[PDB]
Amino acid sequence: CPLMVKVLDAVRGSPAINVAVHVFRKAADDTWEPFASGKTSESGELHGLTTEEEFVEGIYKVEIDTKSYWKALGISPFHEHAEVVFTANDSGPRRYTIAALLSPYSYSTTAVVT
Amino acid sequence: CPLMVKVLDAVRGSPAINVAVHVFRKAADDTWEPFASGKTSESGELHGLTTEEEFVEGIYKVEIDTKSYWKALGISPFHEHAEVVFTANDSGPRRYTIAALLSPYSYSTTAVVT
Amino acid sequence: CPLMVKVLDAVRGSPAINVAVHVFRKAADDTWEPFASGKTSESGELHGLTTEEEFVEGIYKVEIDTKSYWKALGISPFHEHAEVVFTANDSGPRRYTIAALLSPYSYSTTAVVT
Amino acid sequence: CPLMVKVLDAVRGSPAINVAVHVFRKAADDTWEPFASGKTSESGELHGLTTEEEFVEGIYKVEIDTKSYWKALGISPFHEHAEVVFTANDSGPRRYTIAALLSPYSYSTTAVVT
Ligand SMILES: O=C(O)c1ccccc1Nc1cccc(C(F)(F)F)c1
Ligand SMILES: O=C(O)c1ccccc1Nc1cccc(C(F)(F)F)c1
């Protein structure tokens, strides 16, 4: 899997478990087409969203449903969700780890590309 | 002004000057309508995007053109841009400061609501 | 004032008010000598820690009492406190803003130097 | 190993490899006694610093030599190093992952405790 998402909880000091993640790919008409989706595991990870065959060059949007996550904790979050938009494989296939660190009013995101 | 954006550069240790910021508001048909735009000042700040009369409850998207910013520095960035999506004034008018700290492969964003 | 500290709360989406901040300077014998201290205001800011006459080149440590801050909110924090260690004015006097964004198990810190 | 350190590079979008890490434990006389040290691997990770037998309750300081790391990249960093100070095993043995995300003028740190 060339696309992995990892999500952490900065309030509890633990992985953000069962966070919904939706991935979209920009279509020719500049629309976001659904690409893959999943929920993070107990380790706050989501693997197996794609295959390198299917993961072609393009602009992808990784949307993390942070709102639902905090609501389930009884916390009222600021953001509707966290989005990470990036061009991928523009120079051939690469492995992308998109990480997010969550707090009710803040998130940090980083990408490790190899 | 009930909405202010501040953008900092984590690589140079300075405000991110002249970063284009586009603000949209979700329309009834679930589309993003253009709302306000501008460029950050020499202090990395963007004020006067709205008025509290015009700033009604709704879901707003603040889009920060980070890609152009790094390209201008000769650095190749990961993200197409940074987006902050949030519901505003759902409980009456508030002052929102949306801050972003930028790095080529990472960004952190926080909201200070008062 | 050539040294300012700003502290924000990522859980409440507000400035971190009344956070104790202690600044030290490395002495010849490699010990931390007390330099300045204070508490953040209602805006999460702490100014007037020094004067540019007194603020000479050296290694300074800004210590932020985050533990007390979270305890006062009834939250159990991970860190004893946050420390920022940096060499200052090594190239003549500059204005330093040290900012920190706090969460129970995490903190981000940036410097804006001008 | 109950203590793991992971360090990432926000400028290159990769793990921060070969970063020196020194861990200290607060002694009875309130002095920092050397506890363990190592360098991060190609994956930006440092494991095997201790054993759960040796990792007793106490206040520990994890110091990350960020300055040397950036200097080797020809970048001049703001911080001397990044320090993470925390009380550990105060409620019995736990596994601690201390993560840091680095930029020349900024770092973020989080702890995942299990
Ligand atoms: O901790 C992981 O295992 C991790 C994995 C991939 C990328 C980043 C990772 N950690 C981390 C540590 C601090 C801050 C952030 C960020 F906010 F950028 F997502 C991520
Ligand atoms: O530094 C400011 O003046 C600031 C203003 C409003 C909100 C946050 C601010 N500072 C700050 C300091 C560290 C990290 C971040 C964040 F990444 F969240 F944007 C923001």
Instruction: Point out the residue among D59, D79, D110 whose CB comes nearest to the CB of C84.
Output: D79
- Closest D-chain CA to B77: D11
B59/B63 Cα distance (integer angstroms): 13
D110 closest CB neighbour out of A101, A111, A113: A101
Residues of C with CB under 8 A from a CB of B: 8, 10, 13-15, 101, 108, 110-114
The residue type found at C107 is Y
Residue in A46, A45, A28 with CA at minimum distance from that of residue A37: A46
Q: Is D70 left (phi over 0), alpha (psi -120 to 50) or beta?
A: alpha
What CA–CA distance (Å, rounded) separates D61 from B103?
27
User: What experiment produced this structure?
Assistant: X-ray
Pocket test for ligand 1, best of A62, A101, A112 (most atoms within 8 A of CB): A101
Cα angle C113, C4, C37; round to 5: 135
Write the CATH number for B95.
2.60.40.180
The answer to whether the beta carbons of residues C104 and B7 sit under 8 Å apart is no
| Shortest CA gap B13–chain C (Å) | 5
Mention every residue, 6+ apart, whose C-beta is less than 8 A from residue D53: none
Q: Is residue B52 classed as helix, strand or coil in its secondary structure? A: coil
Are C85 and D85 inside 8 Å of each other by CB?
no
The response to whether residue D10 sits with its C-beta less than 6 Å from ligand 1 reads no
Residues β-bridged to residue A33: A25
List the Cα angle A69/A73/A74 in 5-degree steps.
115
| Of A96, A80, A82, A89, the residue nearest A46 (C-alpha) | A96
B110 lines ligand 1 (CB under 6 A): no
Q: Is the CB of B100 under 6 A from ligand 2?
A: yes
Q: Are strands A45-46 and C45-46 parallel, antiparallel or unpaired?
A: unpaired
Looking at the 3D structure of chain D, how many domains does it have? 1
Comparing CB atoms, the residue among A12, A104, A108 nearest residue C105 is A12
β-partners of residue A84 are A62
Q: Contact D107/C108, CB-based, under 8 Å?
A: yes
- Quote the tokens at residue B18: 């002249």
Query: Closest ligand 2 atom to the C-alpha of A106?
Result: 18
DSSP C57-83: SEEEEEEE-HHHHHHHTT---SEEEEE
Do the bridges between strand D45-46 and strand D3-9 make them parallel or antiparallel, or are there none, so unpaired?
A: antiparallel
Query: ∠ CA(D93), CA(D98), CA(D103), 5° rounding?
Result: 170
Q: Are D108 and C111 inside 8 Å of each other by CB? A: no
> What is the DSSP secondary structure assignment for residue D70, as one 8-state letter?
H
Label the pairing between strands D106-113 and C106-113.
antiparallel
Closest of C106, C87, C98 to residue C7, by C-alpha: C98
Taking the centre of ligand 1 as the mean of its atom positions, its distance from the CA of residue C69, in whole angstroms, is: 25
List Cα–Cα distances, B3 to B19, B47, B59, B88, C41, in angstroms: 16, 7, 13, 10, 22
Return the closest-CA partner of residue C85 out of B37, D85, B109.
D85
Identify any residues that bridge with B82 across adjacent strands, giving them in sequence order: B64
Residue A82 · residue A63 · CB < 8 Å: yes
Q: Which of A85, A79, A84 is nearest to A106 (CA)?
A: A79
B26 is in an annotated binding site: no
Which among A73, A72, A74, A84 is positioned nearest to A110, based on CA atoms? Answer: A84
Give the β-pairing of C14-15 and C3-9: antiparallel
Question: Rounded CA gap, A66 and A75, in Å?
Answer: 11
Contact C108 B114 (CB under 8 A): no
Burial per residue of C21-52, b for 16 or more beta-carbon CB atoms within 10 angstroms, e otherwise: bbbbbbeeeeebeebbebebeebbbbeebbee
Of C11, C105, C108, the CB nearest to A13: C105
Q: Is there a contact between C7 and C26 (Cβ–Cβ < 8 Å)?
A: no
Q: Quick one: resolution in A?
A: 2.0
C-chain residues near D112 (CB < 8 A): 105
- Give the residue from A42, A34, A36 showing the smallest Cα distance to A6: A42
Please tell me whether residue D67 adopts helix, strand or coil conformation. Answer: helix
B10 and C110: CB-CB below 8 Å?
yes
For residue D90, give the amino acid letter: D
CB atoms within 10 A of CB B21: 21
User: What secondary structure letter does DSSP report for B72?
Assistant: H
CA angle B98, C2, C22 (to 5 degrees): 80
Residues 6+ apart with CB under 8 A from D85: C79, C80, C81, C83, D59, D60, D61, D62
Query: Which residues in chain B are followed by a discontinuity, with C-to-N distance exceeding 2.5 angstroms?
Result: none
| C-alpha–C-alpha distance, residues C50 and C34, integer Å | 12
Helix (H, G, I), strand (E, B) or coil at D104: coil
d(C-alpha B84, C-alpha B111), whole Å: 9
Q: How many residues in chain D?
A: 114
Which tokens sit at C59?
Answer: 């290694």
Helix (H, G, I), strand (E, B) or coil at D83: strand
Structural domain boundaries enclosing B48: 1-114
Q: What is the DSSP string of chain A?
A: --EEEEEEETTTTEE-TT-EEEEEEE-TTS-EEEEEEEE--TTSEE--S--TTT--SEEEEEEE-HHHHHHHTT---SEEEEEEEEEESBTB---EEEEEEEETTEEEEEEEE-
Pocket flag, ligand 1, residue A110 (CB < 6 Å): yes
Beta bridge partners of D113: D96
Task: For residues B8 and C8, give the distance between their C-alpha atoms in angstroms, rounded to a whole number.
Answer: 15
Burial of C62 (0-12, 13-18, 19+ CB in 10 A): buried
For B66, the 3-state DSSP assignment is helix
Q: Which residue has the tokens 């010849």?
A: C28
Binding site membership of D43 for ligand 1 (Cβ less than 6 Å): no
Q: Is the four-CA dihedral A92, A93, A94, A98 of positive or negative sign?
A: positive
Q: Name the interface residues of C facing A (CB cutoff 8 Å).
A: 9-13, 78, 101, 103-106, 108
Question: Token pair of D105, please?
Answer: 């003028």
- The verdict on whether residue A71 carries a ligand-binding annotation is no
- Residue C13 CA, chain-centre distance (Å), reads 19
Residues 6+ apart with CB under 8 A from C82: C63, C64, C66, C100, C102, C107, C109
- Hey, of D112, D113, D114, which one would you mutate to test binding to chain A, going by the most A CBs within 10 A of its CB? D112
